Design a protein around this motif. Structure first.
Motif, PDB file in Angstrom:
ATOM      1  N   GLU A  61       0.684  -0.647  -0.358  1.00 42.75           N
ATOM      2  CA  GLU A  61      -0.051   0.103   0.323  1.00 42.75           C
ATOM      3  C   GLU A  61       0.619   1.734   0.109  1.00 42.75           C
ATOM      4  N   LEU A  62       1.940   1.557  -1.393  1.00 43.54           N
ATOM      5  CA  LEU A  62       2.456   2.429  -0.895  1.00 43.54           C
ATOM      6  C   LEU A  62       2.406   3.225  -2.445  1.00 43.54           C
ATOM      7  N   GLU A  63       2.549   3.009  -3.180  1.00 40.47           N
ATOM      8  CA  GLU A  63       2.663   3.527  -4.660  1.00 40.47           C
ATOM      9  C   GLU A  63       3.609   3.156  -5.522  1.00 40.47           C
ATOM     10  N   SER A  64       4.392   3.763  -4.473  1.00 40.93           N
ATOM     11  CA  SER A  64       5.831   3.609  -5.013  1.00 40.93           C
ATOM     12  C   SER A  64       6.558   2.653  -6.110  1.00 40.93           C
ATOM     13  N   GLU A  65       7.236   2.962  -6.952  1.00 40.32           N
ATOM     14  CA  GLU A  65       7.731   1.672  -7.007  1.00 40.32           C
ATOM     15  C   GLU A  65       8.837   1.223  -5.541  1.00 40.32           C
ATOM     16  N   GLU A  66       8.664  -0.497  -6.432  1.00 39.56           N
ATOM     17  CA  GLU A  66       9.860  -0.516  -4.965  1.00 39.56           C
ATOM     18  C   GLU A  66      10.891  -0.493  -4.175  1.00 39.56           C
ATOM     19  N   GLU A  67      10.563   0.729  -3.375  1.00 40.18           N
ATOM     20  CA  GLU A  67      11.222   1.126  -3.015  1.00 40.18           C
ATOM     21  C   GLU A  67      12.200   0.159  -2.032  1.00 40.18           C
ATOM     22  N   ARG A  68      11.084  -0.293  -1.006  1.00 40.53           N
ATOM     23  CA  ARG A  68      11.704  -1.589   0.188  1.00 40.53           C
ATOM     24  C   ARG A  68      12.655  -2.225  -1.130  1.00 40.53           C
ATOM     25  N   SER A  69      12.469  -3.261  -1.742  1.00 40.08           N
ATOM     26  CA  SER A  69      12.684  -3.727  -2.598  1.00 40.08           C
ATOM     27  C   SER A  69      14.594  -3.644  -2.541  1.00 40.08           C
ATOM     28  N   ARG A  70      14.329  -2.600  -2.762  1.00 38.90           N
ATOM     29  CA  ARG A  70      15.582  -2.296  -2.964  1.00 38.90           C
ATOM     30  C   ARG A  70      16.332  -2.299  -1.994  1.00 38.90           C
ATOM     31  N   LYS A  71      15.910  -1.805  -0.794  1.00 42.61           N
ATOM     32  CA  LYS A  71      16.015  -1.307   0.576  1.00 42.61           C
ATOM     33  C   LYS A  71      16.969  -3.240   0.855  1.00 42.61           C
ATOM     34  N   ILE A  72      16.255  -3.955   0.814  1.00 40.98           N
ATOM     35  CA  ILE A  72      16.363  -5.775   0.847  1.00 40.98           C
ATOM     36  C   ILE A  72      17.907  -5.651   0.153  1.00 40.98           C
ATOM     37  N   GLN A  73      17.485  -5.488  -0.954  1.00 41.60           N
ATOM     38  CA  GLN A  73      18.940  -4.759  -2.422  1.00 41.60           C
ATOM     39  C   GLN A  73      20.418  -4.154  -1.068  1.00 41.60           C
ATOM     40  N   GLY A  74      19.917  -3.267   0.015  1.00 40.11           N
ATOM     41  CA  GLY A  74      20.672  -2.779   0.027  1.00 40.11           C
ATOM     42  C   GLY A  74      22.057  -3.484   1.476  1.00 40.11           C
ATOM     43  N   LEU A  75      21.308  -4.704   2.206  1.00 44.37           N
ATOM     44  CA  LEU A  75      21.196  -5.657   3.360  1.00 44.37           C
ATOM     45  C   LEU A  75      22.410  -6.647   2.159  1.00 44.37           C
ATOM     46  N   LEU A  76      21.645  -7.440   0.957  1.00 40.29           N
ATOM     47  CA  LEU A  76      21.347  -8.195   0.852  1.00 40.29           C
ATOM     48  C   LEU A  76      22.375  -7.979  -0.606  1.00 40.29           C
ATOM     49  N   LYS A  77      22.709  -6.959  -0.975  1.00 36.26           N
ATOM     50  CA  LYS A  77      23.257  -6.144  -1.866  1.00 36.26           C
ATOM     51  C   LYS A  77      24.591  -7.483  -2.469  1.00 36.26           C
ATOM     52  N   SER A  78      25.378  -7.622  -1.370  1.00 37.11           N
ATOM     53  CA  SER A  78      26.377  -8.697  -1.780  1.00 37.11           C
ATOM     54  C   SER A  78      26.220  -9.575  -2.433  1.00 37.11           C
ATOM     55  N   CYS A  79      24.514 -10.494  -1.736  1.00 32.24           N
ATOM     56  CA  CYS A  79      23.977 -11.434  -2.950  1.00 32.24           C
ATOM     57  C   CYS A  79      25.861 -12.684  -3.438  1.00 32.24           C
ATOM     58  N   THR A  80      25.577 -13.823  -3.117  1.00 30.74           N
ATOM     59  CA  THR A  80      26.360 -14.994  -3.589  1.00 30.74           C
ATOM     60  C   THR A  80      26.325 -16.208  -4.186  1.00 30.74           C
ATOM     61  N   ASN A  81      25.116 -16.287  -4.284  1.00 28.91           N
ATOM     62  CA  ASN A  81      24.265 -17.784  -4.725  1.00 28.91           C
ATOM     63  C   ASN A  81      23.155 -17.670  -5.097  1.00 28.91           C
ATOM     64  N   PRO A  82      22.182 -17.833  -5.502  1.00 25.42           N
ATOM     65  CA  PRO A  82      20.608 -17.901  -5.934  1.00 25.42           C
ATOM     66  C   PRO A  82      19.583 -17.042  -5.326  1.00 25.42           C
ATOM     67  N   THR A  83      20.468 -15.559  -4.824  1.00 28.74           N
ATOM     68  CA  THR A  83      20.092 -14.606  -4.364  1.00 28.74           C
ATOM     69  C   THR A  83      19.350 -13.965  -5.180  1.00 28.74           C
ATOM     70  N   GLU A  84      19.406 -13.896  -6.231  1.00 32.73           N
ATOM     71  CA  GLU A  84      18.989 -13.902  -7.622  1.00 32.73           C
ATOM     72  C   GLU A  84      17.553 -13.889  -7.238  1.00 32.73           C
ATOM     73  N   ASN A  85      16.502 -14.840  -6.660  1.00 29.08           N
ATOM     74  CA  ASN A  85      15.944 -15.380  -5.603  1.00 29.08           C
ATOM     75  C   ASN A  85      14.778 -13.757  -4.608  1.00 29.08           C
ATOM     76  N   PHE A  86      16.392 -14.107  -3.889  1.00 26.12           N
ATOM     77  CA  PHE A  86      15.658 -12.571  -2.572  1.00 26.12           C
ATOM     78  C   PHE A  86      15.614 -11.689  -3.370  1.00 26.12           C
ATOM     79  N   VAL A  87      16.450 -10.908  -4.092  1.00 21.38           N
ATOM     80  CA  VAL A  87      16.559  -9.645  -4.815  1.00 21.38           C
ATOM     81  C   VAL A  87      15.376  -9.700  -5.461  1.00 21.38           C
TER      82      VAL A  87
END
Length: 99
Positions: A61-87
């Motif tokens: 309920e925001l109407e704004s592009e996945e801003e949060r999804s980018r946040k998790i990508q901030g902590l998970l930004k590292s990504c080392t394997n299937p992270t492609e799923n998390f992001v």
């Protein structure tokens, strides 16, 4: 080991489950299933080891592009394997309203 493994779960790098199970959106049921299954895949113990879950908040309920999804990508930004799923999951969920 023979199935029962003592150490080496890498299936939950954080009790991080989205609290979005009540709204008109359509990524809430997936909210708890997407993140829980995420650390289940990811690995916990190298990169995302830390918690990561917020995407559904914006699309919920925001109407704004996945801003949060980018946040998790901030902590998970590292990504080392299937992270492609998390992001892609946090983003995939926001792909229901933000299109």
């Amino acid at each position: 080991g023979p199935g029962g493994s003592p150490g080496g779960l890498q299936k939950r790098h954080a009790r991080v489950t989205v609290k979005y199970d009540r709204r008109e959106l359509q990524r809430r049921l997936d909210v708890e299933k997407w993140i829980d299954g995420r650390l289940e895949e990811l690995y916990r113990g190298r990169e995302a080891d830390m918690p990561d879950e917020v995407n559904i908040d914006e699309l919920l309920e925001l109407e704004s592009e996945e801003e949060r999804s980018r946040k998790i990508q901030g902590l998970l930004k590292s990504c080392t394997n299937p992270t492609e799923n998390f992001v892609q999951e946090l983003l995939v969920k926001l792909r229901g309203l933000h299109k």
